[PDB]
């Protein structure tokens, strides 16, 4: 079957340009059959529209191009039929830009229309690429205490990039009852996680728990002792 | 806008139907995602399949409402089903998708826990609720905070949910406030909405 593969930049600074290219093979980008274009989606959140376009070869005029309203003014999308390429340009990125980035051949009432071509749904996905934007340099975690039959106690992992962060409970000689959650991409530009572990309430004055957070990429290892609050 | 509900279910072999509210034309389509691939066409133009789809995926439409079911549902039919439509001229929007959840384990409602802002994080001039909620069945929840007794939208993050190691699911929230929007109120709330229940907690600056 034919294939839309997706290449750029997976990481751009805030207020910089986010670009990419499809690379369409099996198909050619030059039939009156499709338009070309992009969907987006942001981790997390449902998809979203940017835009397609379509520049078929014929002996009437076939060049449309059409944007998602709220990104016109930052969005420009091309076909270079010849290199059977697809190009998003997205400028002024903020953090919110950050999605899977998805290559999109459209159907619809396209071949044979009335007054305008309405290309309305997707046969064919890229694979999708990850764009995160962010202006963050490599940096380390600050962790916080999440503080306390059964009570929940854990670290709020904060301020932190890139990805990944991992978590363990006194060394690893707590793992029972322990959950660290995915993290999310604040506005900043930095992720924060959480993770919990569920322990007895009758161990909270006598147990001592402590969650170590490793951040590789930063070469940054943090242990918070967690304890029980004065009130 | 299309609006769809959050999550739907049901056991192996049986029939189900999600809807979509907002449709209009016949500029109809569903899409079904796994996660992390992406999203592939079950059915276009109201109840087209493509070639490749099972006739199990059919599609219906009556004046604003459109309906996709799944007759004999099968596990690996679990996934994330987006309505879509043309608009306007020319434009296409999505729906906010729903969770379609095959029925593998007893259902079961999320415990929920609110830990208000830590002393330290406020020493450092920060403040965040952390809402987090666990063993829950289907795997699908939906997130609201109040301040005092007031809907909040800013400052919220929420993670998609995933299995513990019990094969429950876990979903995590944050609001973000300045120490002082903490301090001024009286109370917040994360509410948790999960198939027919919603369970809420309550934290308070002046209380611990």
């Known amino acids: 079957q034919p294939q839309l593969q997706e290449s750029g930049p997976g990481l751009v600074e805030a207020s910089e340009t986010l670009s990419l290219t499809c690379t369409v093979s099996?198909?050619?980008?030059?039939?009156?059959?499709?338009?070309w274009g992009w969907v987006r989606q942001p981790p997390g959140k449902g998809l979203e529209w940017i835009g397609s376009?379509?520049?078929?070869?014929?002996?009437?005029?076939?060049?449309?191009?059409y944007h998602n309203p709220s990104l016109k003014s930052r969005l420009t999308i091309s076909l270079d039929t010849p290199k059977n390429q697809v190009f998003l340009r997205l400028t002024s990125v903020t953090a919110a830009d950050t999605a899977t980035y998805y290559c999109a051949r459209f159907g619809g009432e396209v071949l044979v229309y009335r007054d305008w071509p309405k290309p309305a749904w997707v046969d064919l996905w890229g694979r999708g690429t990850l764009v995160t934007v962010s202006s963050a340099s490599t940096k380390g975690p600050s962790v916080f205490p999440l503080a306390p039959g059964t009570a929940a106690l854990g670290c709020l992992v904060k301020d932190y990039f890139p990805e990944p962060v991992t978590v363990s409970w006194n060394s690893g000689a707590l793992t029972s009852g322990v959950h660290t959650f995915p993290a999310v991409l604040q506005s900043s530009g930095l992720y924060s996680l959480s993770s919990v572990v569920t322990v007895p309430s009758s161990s909270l004055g006598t147990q001592t728990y402590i969650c170590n957070v490793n951040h590789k990429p930063s070469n940054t290892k943090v242990d918070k002792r967690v304890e029980p609050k004065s009130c | 806008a299309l609006t769809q509900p959050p999550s739907a279910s049901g056991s192996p072999g049986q029939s189900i139907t999600i809807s979509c509210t907002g449709t209009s034309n016949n500029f109809v389509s569903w899409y079904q995602q796994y996660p992390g691939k992406a999203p592939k066409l079950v059915i276009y133009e109201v109840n087209k399949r493509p070639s490749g789809v099972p006739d199990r995926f059919s599609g219906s439409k009556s004046g604003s409402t459109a309906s996709l079911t799944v007759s004999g549902l099968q596990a690996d039919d679990e996934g994330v089903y987006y309505c879509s439509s043309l608009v306007g001229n020319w434009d296409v929007i999505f729906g906010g998708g729903t969770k379609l959840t095959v029925l593998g384990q007893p259902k079961a409602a999320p415990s929920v826990t609110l830990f208000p802002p830590s002393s330290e994080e406020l020493q450092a001039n920060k403040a965040t609720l952390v809402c987090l909620i666990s063993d829950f069945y289907p795997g699908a929840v939906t997130v609201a905070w109040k301040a005092d007794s007031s809907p909040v939208k800013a400052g919220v993050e929420t993670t998609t949910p995933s299995k513990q190691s019990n094969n429950k699911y876990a979903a995590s929230s944050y609001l973000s406030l300045t120490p002082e929007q903490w301090k001024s109120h009286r109370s917040y709330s994360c509410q948790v909405t999960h198939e027919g229940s919603t369970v809420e907690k309550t934290v308070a600056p002046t209380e611990c």
């Open positions: 376009l379509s520049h078929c070869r014929s002996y009437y005029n076939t060049d449309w191009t």
């Open positions: 099996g198909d050619s980008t030059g039939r009156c059959n499709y338009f």
